[PDB]
């Protein structure tokens with residue numbers, strides 16, 4: 001009669017687009033007789049959710065299912081805190097359809113310990129179509145063209161860059177800025193954590209670009225939620241936003257269409273590469289009674305029909321490679337094709353900002369340097385020195 005199974009889910013999907021996509025999963029589970037106890041922890045990018053999580057686990061109160069990124073997953077797998085999903089994954093044939101870069105994180109010590117939802121990526125620009133057309137309509141391909149477009153936006157009297165001053169958002173931009181100096185440089189810096197690279201003249205140029213981008217954000221940017229920056233571009237109050245494709249979730253929620261109302265492009269100099277992050281659900285070992293629901297949730301997440309429906313709304317690519325792009329809009333189709341290509345070419349690189357490039361300690365030490373340099377507290381020359389010391393001290 002009434003539902004007899006239930007999942008208690010900690011996640012940070014609280015903005016309108018994110019909430020819309022999550023509704024897809026909730027409805028899916030409900031049809032299976034599984035109700036939902038919602039434990040949302042608001043805060044873009046999940047830092048706040050992870051803080052709540054740590055205190056809860058220390059208190060012997062781990063949630064049944066937890067939204068999680070990258071090296072964070074590994075950290076709990078190492079501790080043996082996560083449920084083994086093998087019996088679902090082996091039987092459902094996950095090995096054949098989940099890209100190897102995601103399996104590095106979804107698997108630990110020979111076992112599936114998370115169910116990957118999607119493949120977001122961070123190196124996008126969201127451009128207001130009306131403002132672009134006012135600016136002559138040319139999509140910027142390189143750095144100089146980007147600056148020329150931002151200058152036109154500025155003379156149009158709008159805020160050229162919609163941005164929120166929070167360390168993770170600053171890092172999100174820096175993903176793409178570093179990426180624009182080439183995939184080799186990005187790997188050397190954020191994946192290999194090579195100190196010569198991190199201290200290079202090229203990294204000094206990257207910070208100089210952040211200074212330039214800083215000059216085009218509005219004076220009230222500090223502390224603004226990412227989705228409120230997205231809204232500025234949606235409303236035509238700002239020209240463009242540099243953000244992961246969760247931003248598209250907002251545009252679609254507002255009824256805006258690719259081509260007509262907005263343009264979606266890779267960050268100039270990064271087409272042909274992606275800086276990826278994959279939201280996964282980790283099922284924490286709790287009561288033995290909860291395991292059937294946990295396994296059902298993992299199965300639901302990896303179902304082809306859900307993999308399409310959820311990601312269409314979310315603004316990410318499916319985690320499964322065998323899910324067709326048919327129901328995706330023009331930007332979602334690009335996301336999928338860019339992922340297949342980057343995967344083939346070895347330019348599908350873990351996002352630093354969103355926890356796929358390096359461990360939390362390193363990520364956080366990078367956040368601090370990037371934030372202070374963007375906010376103008378630190379010169380590019382000094383930022384380079386401090387980045388090397390912070391990274392070396394965190395490894």
Ligand SMILES: OC[C@H]1O[C@H](O)[C@H](O)[C@@H](O)[C@@H]1O
Nearest residue numbers: 018043044045120246279354
């Ligand atoms: O909160 C903003 C975004 O940040 C996170 O890193 C997630 O991967 C994405 O699902 C979410 O929409």
